[PDB]
Symmetry: D2
Subunit: 349 residues, 4 copies
Amino acid sequence: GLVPRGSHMVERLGVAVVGGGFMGGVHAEVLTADPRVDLRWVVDRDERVGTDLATRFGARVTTTLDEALADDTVRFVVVATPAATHEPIAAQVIAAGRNVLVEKPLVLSTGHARQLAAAAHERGVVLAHGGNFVYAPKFVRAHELAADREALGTVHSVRVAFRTSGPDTDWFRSKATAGGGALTDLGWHAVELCRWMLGKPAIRAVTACTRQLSAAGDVEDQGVVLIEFADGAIGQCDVSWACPGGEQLTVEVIGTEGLVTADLWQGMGVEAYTNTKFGAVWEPNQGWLRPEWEWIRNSGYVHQDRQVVDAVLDGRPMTHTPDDAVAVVETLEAAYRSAADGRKVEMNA
Amino acid sequence: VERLGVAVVGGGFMGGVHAEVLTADPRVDLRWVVDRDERVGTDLATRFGARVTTTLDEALADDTVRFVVVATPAATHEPIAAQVIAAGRNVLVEKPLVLSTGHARQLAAAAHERGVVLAHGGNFVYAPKFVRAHELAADREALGTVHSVRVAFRTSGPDTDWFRSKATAGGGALTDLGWHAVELCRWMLGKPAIRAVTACTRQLSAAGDVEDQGVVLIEFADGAIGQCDVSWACPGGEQLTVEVIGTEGLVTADLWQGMGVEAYTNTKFGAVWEPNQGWLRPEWEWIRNSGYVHQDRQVVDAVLDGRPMTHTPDDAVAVVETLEAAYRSAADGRKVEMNA
Amino acid sequence: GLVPRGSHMVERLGVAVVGGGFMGGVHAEVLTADPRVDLRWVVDRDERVGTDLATRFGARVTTTLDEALADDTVRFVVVATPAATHEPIAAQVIAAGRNVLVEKPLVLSTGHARQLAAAAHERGVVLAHGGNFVYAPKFVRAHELAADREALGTVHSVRVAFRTSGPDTDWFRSKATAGGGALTDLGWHAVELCRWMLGKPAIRAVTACTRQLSAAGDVEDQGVVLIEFADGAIGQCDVSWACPGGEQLTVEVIGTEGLVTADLWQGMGVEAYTNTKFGAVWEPNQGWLRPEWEWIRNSGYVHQDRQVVDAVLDGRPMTHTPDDAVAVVETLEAAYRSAADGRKVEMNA
Amino acid sequence: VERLGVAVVGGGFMGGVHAEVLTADPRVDLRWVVDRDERVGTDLATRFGARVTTTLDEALADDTVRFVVVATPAATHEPIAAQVIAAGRNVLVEKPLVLSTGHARQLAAAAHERGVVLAHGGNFVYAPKFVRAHELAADREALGTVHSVRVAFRTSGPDTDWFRSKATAGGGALTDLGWHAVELCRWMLGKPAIRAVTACTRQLSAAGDVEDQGVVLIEFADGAIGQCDVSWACPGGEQLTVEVIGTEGLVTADLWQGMGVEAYTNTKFGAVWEPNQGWLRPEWEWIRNSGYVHQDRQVVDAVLDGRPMTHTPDDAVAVVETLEAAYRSAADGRKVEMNA
Ligand SMILES: NC(=O)c1ccc[n+]([C@@H]2O[C@H](COP(=O)([O-])OP(=O)(O)OC[C@H]3O[C@@H](n4cnc5c(N)ncnc54)[C@H](O)[C@@H]3O)[C@@H](O)[C@H]2O)c1
Ligand SMILES: NC(=O)c1ccc[n+]([C@@H]2O[C@H](COP(=O)([O-])OP(=O)(O)OC[C@H]3O[C@@H](n4cnc5c(N)ncnc54)[C@H](O)[C@@H]3O)[C@@H](O)[C@H]2O)c1
Ligand SMILES: NC(=O)c1ccc[n+]([C@@H]2O[C@H](COP(=O)([O-])OP(=O)(O)OC[C@H]3O[C@@H](n4cnc5c(N)ncnc54)[C@H](O)[C@@H]3O)[C@@H](O)[C@H]2O)c1
Ligand SMILES: NC(=O)c1ccc[n+]([C@@H]2O[C@H](COP(=O)([O-])OP(=O)(O)OC[C@H]3O[C@@H](n4cnc5c(N)ncnc54)[C@H](O)[C@@H]3O)[C@@H](O)[C@H]2O)c1
């Protein structure tokens, strides 16, 4: 083998999805493919958007989180709303005694993260966060090779590059609603991947640089973080919202005896060219392309959500815990401080 | 919730893979392993909690068994499959379905008459990456007129002895690897009829009496040319690539070198298929990525829900004929016309 | 090292170029960069084209081959005219006692090739042919590794693929003027590369398939040749005029212990993307590109012409001789016969 | 036809390369090899038919010598170059030109006053592939606003001992490799001014007292961010890549992994730099492709034909300052502002 045994048709878990936008849709599609899941509610401030998602999966639609929480069959809530709404919404879901999966970034301050985590534990519920790429099949494989100590020797370098042409919806570009720019949006993943590839060691210091390119908004479009891990390995996170030509996500680990690299979007092994356009391909879809296949599964969403559901229904302890989210949140806060005053920031947390 | 009782015949490498794939299906109950070698069958049975026997009829006496996977040497396929169908069971037969076109048509007809599912083990037409490439290649506006398809399949050759005997394998690389190459070529073009086949083969190793490499040029009805390039003599790692070229566009897909992970070591990687020293391109999820999971899900779906199959015994017959024509072409040094 | 010593400024060789089209221009540019070369004449039936090339290099222009041959300073003639004109023109250049470089394909029949070669030898002049890719730096390197017998073991497979979107000028698509289509135009190179990569062994048999896609003309757009070499290795030449997206040229050699591959146009190590267009790039020049650098030198034209000039001026014997051209010509003639009647053709020549 | 008399100082690895490159130039007469080790200098001299000495002044007493290549350890560069310029000779000094910004400005000024050519050994800005990438990256309509440049330069480290001594090398990887990284970054953007530099370094090996790896973030005047990533601790083969990203486009170039030749062997390739087992990506024409040939042709052109140089001592000063600022940043844990 080995093929993981298939879910498991038979338990029933009532689910609410809060935020029926892009990511709420992905989760709705991933969760409804799981035989154990009953999607009961879509919650959204925009009723048209909420309604469109709900009818697609035969859920009920509401604009009030409290209506869904009044449904006793709901035991699990997915929160995919703008970043600054995560903490109030997750705090209320937890207080109502429900399990909750919160999209990246968990919250926007170290305090909120520690306190949300303490509140979930007290309430005896699962708090899970949406760092999907550490569940991506390709990266899991690469993580396994990066852990071969005989093969790599002493690891000294890790690098994660994550580049897009930027967000589609407006809330991403305001601090008030988003917390920060590319460093928050993409840097979340890059920092989680870096830690993880190294075996989650303590971070000793951080250095960072950011720029805002776009006139719209008040957040950065690009950032580079230099992370100093406790063993002395240097991490780099290179993120950007101003990169054309298609999403890029790569991971590189370098030791004294070996190295491991992995490429998500440019490593799918399919190539195409056309003089006109490919209908079934994400724009840009003319000229030379490297088309994706199974983008949802290959980004890790399917494995993440299966393991979250396994944690709620079967008490199967998760690989990635609120401790990991807390570590990411303080790294990002340290990075923003470093960028602001042009100095290395010592960690301690 | 719908349980399906399954028996696996042949407890070797492929029986092992199928057993792994089917027992991951919540609908499936693996009840029997059948194998002529009792030690091999016992090992597989104890691993998956099934009964074991050396006699297929002991497993067919079990009325719970409604579906049988046949993963035995090529020449044993037809007698076994005929038996299974005669006993009213649905069957999946590993590639080379059969060695003769007459036998293929009989089995299909016998299966249709009995009202059972006959399925064949061409797993790579179910591989997720190839399935995506096939979708792109079907965009007529994007590709214009399709005039070339090429499938290269290269390995360092089989390890068990019966593969290199003509009596039991029915062929060498052209059969073992060519089955897939031809099925992929055909499929990438939307499955058009084949009009002619030219082929060249060669035996390299001294062991056995079958070819180690071969090339087939295929003339499809519309005039597009297919190339199938297969070999048991290629070092450095398995290769499987697909290429479709039209006047306005093209599509390529690479299975084993397009998996997007690179590694280097001065020593070795323990978790990697040898060669595991120096520069490597390691696989991940090789069973799923090769198409076995999707194949076996769609065959179980057919048996349970009557949901009609994408790849049919008609496809398998087309492949058998082509391989028959290719071996004749290789012997006669001439293009062979397909009156079928 | 090692860097080849630089030409050698000082000898003077008067040159005529016949055919001032695309390839006559390339040669004019390569030859005038050689300090030893004096480009005296451009000969072309079209005076405007001839004149445009000549003024660019300060040559004289004529429409009569005889005018250039009346110039005693001319000792070396480059023939870059349509394929069917090669034999008469080269026969006249040779008879006038001049050295001659004839573009691919040398001539269109085995007889003509043997007889042209015999005539040059009798006249004591160099006859050279324009198979440039066997001089391409990258392929020379690959040829050297393919000759490591310990590293490859027994070589059993060689493959050359050569694909373009087809010729620009009309004469290429008529048998009368061109001899044949892609199999002649591209197959010339593919067959020469195959032989060479294997150490130029005898060819025992040939099998071939061709199709005509285009309505214009009467020659084939695609062809595949299966070559059986004497040692038992199988060669493949895959050529096409109907391939979009940019020129492709690759070489693959496979043995029992190893393999060697090389990629000319997709192996240049430069990548680019733009949302608009790159001005300095060969169309298609939008979207994802793999731009060439030094395309003339990297295709081998510079090394070929330097070695041809070395042969004339310094008697330095050439690596690739008229014997090699004769072998290619009969392979192609065998291939066309095989395609015509659907049978393997045994060689003997 | 115009002959230029040359002396090479330092008969080691780089002196060897330069001697190879310059003697291929028909305009050049290599007359002297100078080296403190007589055996090393003698070996190089006998190979190229030059005179040999251990005393630079014996070679400067020769009035035929109009041009000197200095390929000695970093700390020896300034005293030697000063001597050569003081004697009225044109000079080419290998990378790290000098270790101090003051010294760089003196040499440039001394050279300008004497009326001679001072050139520095940044060969990769002359590499044909990078020169092409630089042309693409200069297409403003195609790239839009340029906001990122990244240069990664990775090796398994130097083999001679003086490289790992601060006294004689003036630095580790950040100096040895970083010189190129910074010069490439700067050049790819059209050579704008540098406003600030942040850096992090680390020593891995126990031997020596210099860093093995370092990263530099560079803030250019317009606001574009440069990254220079260098390391002596990277296995599997040398890497050198360049990346430029703008809002409308991007350009990347790969020197050692973008050479387009792939090989595999179960044994080894004799004609290949080790690692020469397993999967390889072999180099071809490494001297020319690294830029040495073009560099040395353009320096000889300058000396003979007064044809002004693309890369000037002003560029070298900019690089020296940046490296100075980077090492301070690495020590202080802070961004260093460039008031130059
Ligand atoms: N892990 C990933 O790969 C990934 C990818 C994209 C986005 N995200 C994250 O998911 C979350 C949502 O992102 P998105 O792309 O789906 O945004 P989106 O703008 O597409 O959707 C946001 C939705 O939330 C609704 N909404 C706003 N406030 C609400 C509220 N108080 N209550 C209920 N609904 C509300 C909005 O009407 C909208 O429908 C973000 O936190 C984002 O960072 C994660
Ligand atoms: N689709 C694929 O990717 C793929 C890959 C490998 C093999 N196959 C095919 O699967 C089939 C088996 O190949 P394999 O690699 O597993 O071979 P194998 O030698 O590993 O196993 C074959 C097993 O069948 C047993 N056996 C032999 N004759 C039998 C008989 N009459 N009745 C019952 N059992 C018998 C043998 O003891 C043996 O254990 C072949 O047809 C092969 O072509 C397909
Ligand atoms: N080795 C290579 O890489 C390569 C590439 C392209 C073409 N070629 C070959 O070079 C030759 C010319 O090809 P091209 O692309 O330059 O064609 P072209 O059509 O661009 O140029 C042909 C030129 O020859 C002129 N011409 C025709 N008949 C003439 C005659 N009797 N006397 C003098 N001039 C005459 C024409 O006016 C025209 O200027 C062909 O044989 C071709 O196969 C080789
Ligand atoms: N541009 C490049 O790609 C590149 C590559 C390697 C080295 N370099 C540089 O070239 C220079 C030499 O490096 P190397 O690898 O050739 O070192 P090396 O140790 O191989 O050779 C240095 C030589 O200089 C001799 N020498 C030492 N002190 C001397 C002195 N005072 N006077 C005369 N000779 C003296 C030594 O005997 C030695 O033979 C260094 O500055 C290095 O940074 C540049």
